[PDB]
Design an enzyme around this catalytic site. Structure first.
Site: not given
Lengths: 489, 92
Positions: A26, A59, A219
């Protein structure tokens, strides 16, 4: 105080994954955040395209928290390693992701550990090379969990989502419905394996070492399954990919999603499953595998395959128009597959396989050609000790106990297994005027192995198993026929 | 005969960089010579190229920065299975 999503994946009866490692590809992460500090290791692998630490880390930090976070994680205190393949705007490349996957494989070769779960909370368009790389890494015995994608679209058009040997996860909300994201939302379709909580998911915020934020997406959903898989693998380290996928399916909550949210054609293709941890004897697991649509070509065939360690116990087919020539079970490489035939003037058909874990199994197919000018085409498992688990039928025209019966103009195929530990029964339900579909369901504790329509002159579109229910679709009367088996110990 | 592929989502395409994927059996040593052969053939034709990475472990092949003009040539290199133009992926 228990976050809705952690309660949602808690089974009806319940009491980390420490010998498992989870890899995360990520953005960079704030590794010293209190939710994950000490449990996530930054590899410092980086491969990202050209474009604030908190914004950049947002994120990945949240996702690391969802998987293993101390307070809000699924697999609290499971080990993670993170690779950076997305930049500060959350963008990466296929080649970058390829190199990251290669990095994980090299590390494993250099220093072997236990089961590895790889989380890929990212998506791009369908990519042949990315799918091949995931397939390869999976065949090397690694488990990949990926996001279905947030484009409110068919996930088969994206990668790695569309890679068959990865586990692809869509997002549902606190109402168990598919998550909307602006004008878009969770992807769907037959490349999606199940859904999991992916809206208003609380987790580590990279704003400060103790801060928390709520995020939404596939996700987040994929992170839940990655953590669930970590737990399953910790308890049963020897699970193969197929065995893990069947458990995820089996322990999921069934039929809570309202399919109307999906476009019409995708409703049959989309698993109505919301993930959950196992409640924690041998029993019979089966799953339904839809093929890619065959296409309009005259001699088109759709094929549905099981995993190498599964058996194919039945084979059905479906067409929206209903122009079809049925389906057959055949051997390829020495494994039976499910093969459906399009009508010469039709748009295409789906082949639909029923794939089960049956180790102590010797199965085979018995076929009879059309009887023609008889009552009908018949065949049955002739030897003692063998049970019928599925019937199939395919024809060549355009117009027309342990035993399968077919139309007099059709070939008939029975799937027969020698499996003494197994008991099967046939349940039938007929509707005189089928409103749209006729269904019949196996009893609680039995597993649907076979689903078909009783022969006749009905304009049936086809049949398929939905979990443990047989669904027959129609455009005399129409009868659904389910074959149900259970273990006896 | 080797084939060429790029992202069907045009705005997500990243032209100018290509993943050259070799046949399964292909050994790392062969991968490296194929890449050197491309640079050399590319150079004889006036084209700069840059080999950004050679793959070993999952998938034999390499990542090359070059003009797309060179794709026909690259597709005739030994051991080539297919070539894919790089493209974007996004956090979900």
């Amino acid at each position: 105080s228990i976050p809705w999503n952690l309660e949602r994946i808690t089974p009806p009866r319940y009491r980390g994954g420490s010998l498992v490692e989870v890899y995360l590809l990520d953005t960079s992460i704030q590794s010293d955040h209190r939710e994950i500090e000490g449990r996530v290791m930054v590899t410092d692998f980086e491969n990202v395209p050209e474009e604030q630490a908190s914004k950049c880390d947002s994120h990945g930090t949240h996702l690391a928290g969802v998987v293993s976070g101390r307070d809000a994680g699924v697999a609290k205190g499971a080990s993670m390693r993170s690779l950076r393949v997305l930049n500060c705007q959350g963008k990466g490349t296929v080649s970058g992701t390829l190199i990251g996957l290669e990095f994980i494989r090299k590390s494993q070769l250099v220093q072997p550990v236990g089961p590895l779960v790889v989380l890929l909370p990212l998506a791009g368009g369908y990519s042949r090379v990315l799918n091949a790389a995931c397939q390869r890494l999976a065949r090397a015995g690694v488990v990949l969990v990926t996001a279905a994608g947030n484009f409110r679209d068919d996930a088969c058009l994206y990668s790695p989502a569309s890679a068959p040997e990865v586990i692809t996860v869509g997002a549902t909300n606190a109402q168990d419905q598919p998550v909307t994201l602006g004008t878009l939302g969770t992807n769907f379709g037959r490349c999606v394996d199940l859904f999991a909580p992916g809206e208003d998911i609380i987790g580590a915020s990279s704003d400060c070492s103790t801060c928390f934020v709520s995020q939404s997406g596939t996700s987040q959903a994929a992170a839940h399954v990655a953590g669930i898989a970590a737990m399953m693998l910790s308890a049963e380290p020897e699970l193969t990919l197929a065995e893990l996928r069947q458990r995820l399916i089996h322990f999921s909550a069934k039929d809570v999603i309202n399919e109307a949210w999906f476009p019409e054609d995708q409703r049959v293709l989309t698993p109505n499953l919301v993930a959950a941890l196992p409640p924690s004897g041998w029993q019979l697991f089966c799953r339904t595998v839809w093929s890619a649509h065959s296409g309009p070509t005259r001699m088109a065939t759709a094929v549905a395959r099981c995993a190498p360690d599964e058996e194919l116990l039945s084979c059905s087919s479906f067409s929206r128009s209903g122009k079809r020539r049925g389906e057959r079970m055949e051997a390829q490489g020495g494994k039976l597959v499910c093969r459906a035939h399009n009508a010469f003037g039709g748009e295409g058909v789906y082949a639909i396989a029923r794939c089960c874990l049956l180790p102590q199994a010797n199965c085979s197919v018995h076929t009879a050609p059309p009887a023609e000018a008889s009552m009908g085409t018949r065949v049955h498992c002739h030897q003692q000790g063998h049970v019928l688990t599925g019937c199939s039928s395919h024809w060549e025209v355009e117009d027309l106990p342990n035993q399968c019966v077919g139309h007099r103009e059709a070939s008939i195929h029975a799937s027969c297994c020698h499996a003494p530990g197994l008991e099967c029964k046939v349940k039938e339900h007929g509707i005189p005027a089928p409103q749209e579909q006729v269904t019949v369901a196996c009893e609680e504790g039995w597993t649907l192995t076979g689903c078909s329509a009783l022969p006749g002159t009905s304009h049936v579109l086809g049949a398929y198993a939905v979990d443990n229910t047989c669904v027959v679709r129609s455009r005399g009367a129409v009868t659904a026929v389910a074959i149900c088996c259970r273990s006896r110990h | 005969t080797a084939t060429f592929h790029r992202c069907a989502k045009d705005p997500w395409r990243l032209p100018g960089t290509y993943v050259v994927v070799l046949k399964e059996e292909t050994h790392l040593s062969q991968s490296e010579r194929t890449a050197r052969r491309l640079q050399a053939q590319a150079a004889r034709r006036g084209y700069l190229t840059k080999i950004l990475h050679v793959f070993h472990g999952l998938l034999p092949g390499f990542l090359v920065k070059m003009s797309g003009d060179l794709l026909e040539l690259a597709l005739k290199l030994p051991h080539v299975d297919y070539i894919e133009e790089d493209s974007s992926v996004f956090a979900q």
